[PDB]
Amino acid sequence: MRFVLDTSIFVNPEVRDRFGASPTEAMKTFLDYAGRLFGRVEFYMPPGIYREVVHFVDEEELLPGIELYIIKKPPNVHDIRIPAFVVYELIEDVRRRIDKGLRVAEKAVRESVVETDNVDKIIQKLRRNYRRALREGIVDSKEDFELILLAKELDATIVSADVGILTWAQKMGIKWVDAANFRELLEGLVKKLGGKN
Amino acid sequence: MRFVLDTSIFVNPEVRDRFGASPTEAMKTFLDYAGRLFGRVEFYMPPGIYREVVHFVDEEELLPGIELYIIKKPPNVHDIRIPAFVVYELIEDVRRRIDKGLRVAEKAVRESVVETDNVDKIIQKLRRNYRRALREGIVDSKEDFELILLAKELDATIVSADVGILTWAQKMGIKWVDAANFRELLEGLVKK
């Protein structure tokens, strides 16, 4: 049994809280389950996803588990074929993520700026935040593709709280589970396989 | 012989001028060649590309040719498989198209915003121009994929002046020609 993990159960405050009060504690709780399933169940992340979660998590404090129990593996691309509609999936993902980023970038400017600020100061704040929304929207959509393609090739279950990802997985015939229910699934996997829970 | 046409030879002033002084004139000149090659050479556009060209071209003033000699055909997507690296090509294309838009949005904001605008007005000018850059960057990248996939399925030659599209065609082993030389290519086909 193989799982491909999105950032959700570690970095999304409304789902990672089922595992811990911080990303580091959430990861620690996850790794305790992953350790108890070592050799029976494998957990994968594309490298770009892993780099995002460990921006928030204390990697040094979670050795050896953080390196042994999460497999960092980019999907294979050479000689691999995918449905053509995947391109439309990626396009909607980019538009979905960028539109949200623009709102976030706008709301961020409207909290920092005061009516007395000059024109150039206002423009540089919006341009900076808009540029960040675009670049993050693009990388994250590519990372979404990596997750999908990795789980497809591994015949693994995707673990995410992102509705767009789960619908995309569904359409491609990829197994998935809602990340909000992942701890429940992990608890049931330990009980099905033995050992202290 | 089959050709898949980008907007270039109709809407890009630096390329269509080789066919006519306006998009309508360019289309008229092109249809002149396309009519005389009817039955020998077929010309295709994805529907989204066609709608873009005829926003600038008076479709009414060019009947019957504009309807007979250009085949509007979306690529097939159902049950179609593509190489996975196409998605990476599309990602680079999106970034390329968005980057171009940012320059357009940049100059447009720079001219539109004035010292007197309140905070709401500056934000609305910036948001409006950036959203338009994003929207067009997204549509153009999807149309670029439609062009690419169409030419793939037809084994047709892409006709474009867009560096992104030609590089994408090259990587995928799709025939292409620089649209700046298309009239010259058409002239040589007609003499045949």
Numbering used by the authors:
A (entry chain A): 1 to 197
B (entry chain B): 1 to 192
What does the paper say about this structure?
Interestingly, recent studies showed that pre-tRNA 5’-end can also be cleaved by protein-only RNase Ps (PRORP). Like the eukaryotic PRORPs, HARPs are members of the PIN domain superfamily, but belong to a different subgroup (PIN_5 cluster). Compared to eukaryotic PRORP, HARP is much shorter and it lacks both PPR and the central domains. Like Aq_880 from A. aeolicus, in vitro cleavage assays showed that PbHARP, TcHARP, TmHARP and TrHARP can all remove the 5’-end of pre-tRNA, suggesting that pre-tRNA 5’-end processing is one conserved activity of HARP.
No crystal grew for Aq_880, TmHARP or TrHARP, but we successfully solved the apo-form structures of PbHARP and TcHARP at atomic resolution. TcHARP crystal belongs to P212121 space group and there is only one TcHARP dimer in the asymmetric unit. Both PbHARP and TcHARP are of α/β fold in nature; they share six β-strands (β1-β6) and ten α-helices (α1-α10). The dimerization manner of TcHARP is similar to that of PbHARP. However, structural analysis revealed some conformational differences between the PbHARP and TcHARP dimers, especially in the HB regions. Further analysis showed that the overall folds of the two TcHARP monomers are similar to that of PbHARP monomer A (or C), the conformational differences are mainly caused by the bending of α8 of PbHARP monomer B (or D), hinged at residue E147. The root-mean-square deviation (RMSD) value between TcHARP and PbHARP A or C monomers is 1.0 Å, whereas is 1.4 Å between TcHARP and PbHARP B or D monomers. The oligomerization state of TcHARP is changeable. At higher concentration of salt (200–500 mM), it exists as dimer; however, it assembles into larger oligomers in buffer containing 100 mM salt. The apo-form structures of PbHARP and TcHARP are also in an inactive form.
